Design a protein around this ligand. Structure first.
Ligand SMILES: NC(=O)c1ccc[n+]([C@@H]2O[C@H](COP(=O)([O-])OP(=O)(O)OC[C@H]3O[C@@H](n4cnc5c(N)ncnc54)[C@H](OP(=O)(O)O)[C@@H]3O)[C@@H](O)[C@H]2O)c1
Ligand SMILES: NC(=O)c1ccc[n+]([C@@H]2O[C@H](COP(=O)([O-])OP(=O)(O)OC[C@H]3O[C@@H](n4cnc5c(N)ncnc54)[C@H](OP(=O)(O)O)[C@@H]3O)[C@@H](O)[C@H]2O)c1
Ligand SMILES: NC(=O)c1ccc[n+]([C@@H]2O[C@H](COP(=O)([O-])OP(=O)(O)OC[C@H]3O[C@@H](n4cnc5c(N)ncnc54)[C@H](OP(=O)(O)O)[C@@H]3O)[C@@H](O)[C@H]2O)c1
Ligand SMILES: O=c1c(O)c(-c2ccccc2O)oc2cc(O)cc(O)c12
Ligand SMILES: O=c1c(O)c(-c2ccccc2O)oc2cc(O)cc(O)c12
Ligand SMILES: O=c1c(O)c(-c2ccccc2O)oc2cc(O)cc(O)c12
Lengths: 238, 249, 249, 248
């Protein structure tokens, strides 16, 4: 049978491009969404028109709460139910906004910027591992600018740092199960002009290309690695 | 007057050593504690006998919850209430225990490991900054964050997040003259419940002396970062690890 | 026409697997070698049997000296002479041996370890850029550069310098459309001289499979970085280490 | 009785401030210089006025060559001949200039890689072979991962010095020799540089919109060689005002 992948936040932008490329490579896909139901179904419709019953949607709020563990279990379960297997988890969903240190409640901001960006990936990783010839792997969507962060983005940056720690800890702990764990770290008119490879427009498809590599048989010895896909931006001094 | 410092988890071990060395340097100190009330009061008693009215205690749970922002605000408020100023914040308190991927509910583990290690330092940083000389924050990091112990993912995530806070807060608070740095132990004071044979296994890994860091050695790096000799240093994390992090598998 | 690639130290082991995979992908190849003439010519013959006029050899010593720039210029020139273009440079050649701090002279060890691992890649990069589609350079780095082998200081210095070159050249060559990236093996093909018991010692450290990387697995990451699927990737170093660099002492 | 230190490139700027602070802390000092003889001698004379027979100068070119190992051995030897001991080595001397990809190139290699990396390696070898609170401090660069355009050889040399710091920390730890680094961002700016250009760099620094003084860099060196750092080895302390944290 065809392998199957879960992509979180898959309705639009980067998650959509990732789901499309996995599907094109022969994966069946779970398109996770929170609010973007119309877009998720529209994508599933397009993929199913290409190959019948190869795409399903799954609703879950990835905010941290007492029910986040159940929601993450359901995302993984939905893959097994539709397809009988779950070979690939892509932790792509993320919240992004500033949280200034000097002036949503702050604990709501914690729930979104830490919950969605780090805790949901952790819980999804647990559920994925617990439910397990094969080529099993997880890819976490990191941030190339994690060590040169945007001003007043402390909670966002903390969450993306935690995600690096998860990538490394899970790579170590899941290696005995043959589960590889890796990351892809994107960068980004003012910003475009900073990018060394700025002649090329940045695209969601370029991010997806790195995800496709990492889940492929061409990356079977790669675990705990984070691939920057940033056009050189992180190399540029102030 | 004398400057004042908040040290979290200061009743015992590394936090106590930091509080003691800050006090010896001339600081008035808030000794934060959670469960170790007898030890915290005993320490404050010793310090106050040395110089009267220079130490207070402050109890707070630093587990994440909807009241954590108020608890962190209160810790900073206690320093201003006792001493009329708050010059230094040391984020030392930490929960440390395994959370295998394959007692406590997972959401409790998240609240404790991510709350103590990262969210509380964030909220304390917010409160410290908002309440405002040589002002600085020192975060107790971990030199082994990139070579983590097996089955400690939540602990490791929290310490990674603490590196992110150190860097983000250094950037953002620099215009206010608040420096933000870290001290990253490798192996220092081993868990009390750890057997000696297991302690020795870890000691033997350390290139510089085949021994763990003393609490004083960790405190020495904190003292440097808060001192005038570190006035241009912000966003730096000083490993105090005897070379441990350089040793391959 | 078909694009062309220079692979240094391509007669044997990882460089050979890289040359083969680039050839299989459609590249014409310059097989650079130093001492392994029989192996280099044998490889070129095998590749030419597959597609005529798609492989040549080029001999050069990559030890540092006042003639190293001419040797590196010649390697790039050989690709233009054979194929009329040079699209890819893979800096794979390496000297590897201990140089303790406490029968070669020290300046020979410097010339060999720093020359082959760092200076030659720099000069080859200069020549490649000056002679100039999907142009790129791939440097063979080392996943263990921050947890080095005992008594390998010069080797480790050379590999650190190669990280610096990768980043500096990525920055400087980006406006010419030349990407510069690295592939960092952990334990891959072990030294020929090594005993089986010692080889197994190292194999057992690797989390993913308890085995070293095959040459083919290292080559796979090089193939990705030179491909159209990596056109926004520059200044990146991909570890291909089975998790080895994540394992504490 | 009093410990002794070698400081390379100690005649001016950062190395001068390091030599002064070490001397103030109680060290006897070898002031290494290459071209700056008058400044080296003036510093030695000032230090000897403070305490007799506590400073000497030592001339050497630290460019890579067949004679570099002997030169580096002689620098370390000069400390033992003057003071009977050598407790601290500070690798401060540096060549710094652009080397665009697109002086001969091999001269540039010899200068940039020799001063910044090979000379520190050879001095480390000689220091260790000759051997309490022993340590080495290497002057690194906080911007090694966000380098200036067209500075590849300089950047390669400073990356190699990070590798040396870590490899030597590991290998010399059994001998009780600690090996650490101090990594400035922008400190003392080139003397010729216009104030208007200096200001473009100063404005980038989060902490105070100014460059580090030489004394602030020296303060981190003094901490690292002190009894307060006796468990610290293989560590590189940035002294950069937050500069390395600032995105493009
Ligand atoms: N020890 C090492 O080898 C080592 C290695 C790497 C990093 N570090 C870091 O260095 C710092 C000091 O280490 P340590 O071994 O001295 O720390 P520790 O003894 O493990 O913990 C210090 C204090 O943290 C407080 N704490 C724990 N959970 C809390 C909660 N939910 N709310 C409020 N306070 C809480 C406790 O206070 P009460 O006792 O009052 O309840 C405890 O005494 C920590 O940040 C640690 O992560 C230590
Ligand atoms: N193997 C591993 O486990 C491992 C681990 C980390 C990094 N790496 C890196 O990956 C790359 C390939 O590894 P490998 O084990 O296949 O390499 P290797 O066999 O050690 O060396 C590859 C080739 O480099 C050439 N070479 C050595 N000294 C030279 C000189 N002075 N001038 C010109 N060429 C010279 C040799 O060519 P001739 O035979 O023609 O003389 C040799 O065949 C290297 O850069 C290595 O540092 C490998
Ligand atoms: N200044 C900064 O902003 C900055 C930033 C990042 C890193 N750093 C690092 O911090 C350290 C001190 O910086 P600095 O600006 O004070 O250094 P500097 O003035 O550029 O150089 C220090 C000394 O190095 C010596 N030197 C240069 N080439 C030499 C050679 N071939 N042989 C022997 N000695 C040689 C020179 O000695 P003579 O004058 O006697 O010839 C010079 O006075 C350096 O390692 C530098 O790379 C500085
Ligand atoms: O990080 C710790 C740690 O690695 C270790 C550690 C424990 C056993 C063996 C090696 C260790 O580094 O102990 C800790 C104890 C604490 O109270 C708090 C901590 O953060 C640590
Ligand atoms: O870096 C290498 C290495 O660590 C090792 C290595 C050797 C023994 C045990 C573990 C290792 O990673 O082998 C190499 C062999 C080479 O020909 C070239 C190299 O760069 C290495
Ligand atoms: O690294 C340096 C540097 O970045 C700079 C620098 C120069 C201009 C603008 C910004 C800088 O960081 O100056 C140096 C001067 C030296 O004498 C030696 C150095 O290593 C530097």
């Amino acid at each position: 049978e065809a392998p199957a992948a879960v992509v979180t936040g898959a309705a639009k932008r980067i998650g959509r491009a990732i789901a499309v490329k996995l599907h094109q490579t022969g994966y069946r896909v779970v398109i996770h969404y929170h609010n973007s139901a119309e877009a998720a179904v529209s994508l599933a419709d397009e993929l199913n028109k290409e190959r019948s019953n190869t795409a399903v949607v799954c609703q879950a709020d990835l905010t941290n709460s007492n029910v986040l563990p159940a929601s993450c279990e359901e995302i993984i379960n939905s893959c097994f139910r539709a397809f009988g297997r779950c070979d690939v988890l892509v932790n792509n969903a993320s919240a992004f906004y500033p949280t200034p240190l000097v002036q949503k409640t702050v604990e709501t901001q914690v729930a979104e910027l830490i919950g969605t960006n780090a805790i949901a990936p952790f819980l999804l990783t647990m559920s994925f591992a617990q439910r397990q010839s094969s080529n099993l792997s997880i890819v976490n969507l990191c941030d190339a600018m994690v060590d040169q962060p945007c001003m007043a983005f402390s909670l966002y940056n903390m969450g993306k740092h935690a995600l690096v720690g998860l990538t490394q800890s899970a790579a170590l702990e899941l290696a005995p199960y043959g589960i590889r764990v890796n990351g892809v770290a994107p960068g980004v008119d003012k910003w475009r002009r900073k990018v060394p490879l700025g002649r090329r427009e940045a695209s969601a498809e370029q991010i997806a290309d790195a995800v496709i590599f990492l889940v492929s048989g061409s990356a079977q010895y790669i675990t705990g690695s984070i691939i920057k896909v940033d056009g050189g931006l992180s190399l540029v001094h102030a």
